[PDB]
Amino acid sequence: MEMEKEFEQIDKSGSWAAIYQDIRHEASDFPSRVAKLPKNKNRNRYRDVSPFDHSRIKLHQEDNDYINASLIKMEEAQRSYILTQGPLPNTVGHFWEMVWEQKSRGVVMLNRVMEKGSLKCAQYWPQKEEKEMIFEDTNLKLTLISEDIKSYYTVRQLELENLTTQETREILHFHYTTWPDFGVPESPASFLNFLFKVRESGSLSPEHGPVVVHCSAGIGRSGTFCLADTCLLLMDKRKDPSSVDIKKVLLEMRKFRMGLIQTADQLRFSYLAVIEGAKFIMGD
Ligand SMILES: CS(=O)(=O)N1CCCc2ccccc21
């Protein structure tokens, strides 16, 4: 069923809470035993948000390989994403170790460091060119190269150096700075413009490791970003774009990380973004 008609029928019937609970009931339940080990308590922001064992990213070290991060591998769309929590004071070195080891070209940040008067993630990148950051626990150096501040987002060029080998790489930081503290954006226009800037950069392409995507827990806004991107790519690839079923794509992605899309308002927003983004790409 054309999702735009499904959309108007859910709106007219006011049945967004019922549709969202049906997704919650059908979602996969896989073990997360490594996340719950006592040694990993200060590596988790939220007790109820953990990576599954089967899809978790492993750090390349014998001491403790754990990070709160999941590989979302979308087979038909030929896209992969790493979804992760906002870094904690004791996991900023792990975060950049993961970017290095997975060969990522982009980091997508969908939160502010402070929201609702509380810290939602560590200040994990440098704010001034002449004040670089050294992560002694993972042997990395990170330097701010340039910053472009726009009304709805900021793009940063960063240099990450592996101090062990003196190899360097350019990382692109895409920071969506205007998601409201409560609810979802009224229009998906700035969020779609942002998604198109990340695509334009090469950060989502198969010549690179997977993009790293985060918010505070790495499931709500982060889930909206990957769900919208995958649904639009399938609408381009298939003979019948009207066959793309957003609820079935979301349940496929929930095989790889729990809790993607946190509210009925985030579900409605993801439908709006896909419907509006389909028109704009259609030369329309
Ligand atoms: C009353 S509702 O269940 O249909 N609902 C649930 C929460 C999200 C939403 C957004 C716009 C309009 C209705 C809703």
Helix, strand, coil distribution of the chain in percent, nearest 5: 35, 20, 45
Question: Which residues, other chains included, contact 20 with Cβ-Cβ below 8 Å and sequence gap of 6+?
Answer: 261, 263, 264, 267
| DSSP E strands, 58-149 | 69-74, 79-84, 106-109, 114-115, 118-119, 133-135, 140-149
- Choosing from 121, 215, 226, 231, the catalytic residue is 215
- Centre of ligand 1 to C-alpha 268, Å, is 8
**DSSP symbols for 25-62:** HHS-----HHHHSGGGGGG-S-TT----TTTBPPPS-S
Residue pair 35/44 in contact (Cβ under 8 Å)? The answer is: yes
Q: Which two tokens stand for residue 135?
A: 């992560």
Residue 242 annotated as part of some ligand binding site: no
Chain breaks in the chain (C to N over 2.5 A) after: none
Residue identifier of the C-alpha nearest atom 8 of ligand 1:
265
Ligand 1 pocket list (CB less than 6 A): 14-17, 264-265, 268
Q: Under CATH, what is the fold of the domain 1-283?
A: Protein-Tyrosine Phosphatase; Chain A (3.90.190)
Question: Which residues, other chains included, contact 279 with Cβ-Cβ below 8 Å and sequence gap of 6+?
Answer: none
Residue 221 annotated as part of some ligand binding site: yes
Burial of 34 (0-12, 13-18, 19+ CB in 10 A): middle
Question: Which residues, other chains included, contact 176 with Cβ-Cβ below 8 Å and sequence gap of 6+?
Answer: 108, 109, 110, 152, 153, 191, 194, 221
Taking the CA of residue 18 as reference, the ligand 1 atom at the shortest distance is 3
72: closest CA among 206, 172, 210?
Answer: 210
Q: Which two tokens stand for residue 119?
A: 């810290």
Amino acid at 135: F
- Centre of ligand 1 to C-alpha 264, Å, is 6
Residue identifier of the C-alpha nearest atom 5 of ligand 1:
16
- Report d(CA 138, CA 129) in Å as an integer: 21
Probe ligand 1: pick from 265, 267, 269, max atoms within 8 Å of CB?
265
Residue 114's DSSP bridge partners are: 119
Residue 9 annotated as part of some ligand binding site: no
Residue pair 23/267 in contact (Cβ under 8 Å)? The answer is: yes
Question: Which residues, other chains included, contact 73 with Cβ-Cβ below 8 Å and sequence gap of 6+?
Answer: 55, 80, 256
Probe ligand 1: pick from 12, 15, 16, max atoms within 8 Å of CB?
16
Probe ligand 1: pick from 9, 23, 268, 270, max atoms within 8 Å of CB?
268
- Report d(CA 273, CA 188) in Å as an integer: 5
Taking the CA of residue 20 as reference, the ligand 1 atom at the shortest distance is 6
95: closest CA among 152, 45, 52?
Answer: 45
Q: Which two tokens stand for residue 163?
A: 């101090």
- Report d(CA 224, CA 12) in Å as an integer: 23
Amino acid at 151: S
**Known catalytic membership, residue 226:** no
277: closest CA among 229, 238, 242, 222?
Answer: 229
Residue 216 annotated as part of some ligand binding site: yes
Helix axes 246-253, 16-26, angle to 10 degrees: 40
Residue pair 3/246 in contact (Cβ under 8 Å)? The answer is: yes
- Report d(CA 109, CA 86) in Å as an integer: 8
Spell out the domain ranges in the chain: 1-283
**Torsion angles phi and psi, residue 156, rounded to 5:** -120, 140
Residue 278 annotated as part of some ligand binding site: no
- Report d(CA 198, CA 202) in Å as an integer: 7
Method by which the coordinates were obtained: X-ray
Can you list the pairs that 9-16 forms with residues at least 24 positions away whose Cβ atoms lie under 8 Å? 10/268, 16/264, 16/265, 16/267, 16/268
Q: Which two tokens stand for residue 227?
A: 């769900």
Question: Which residues, other chains included, contact 36 with Cβ-Cβ below 8 Å and sequence gap of 6+?
Answer: 50
Q: How far is CA 256 from the centre of its chain?
A: 13
Q: Which two tokens stand for residue 233?
A: 């790519």
Helix (H, G, I), strand (E, B) or coil at 130: coil
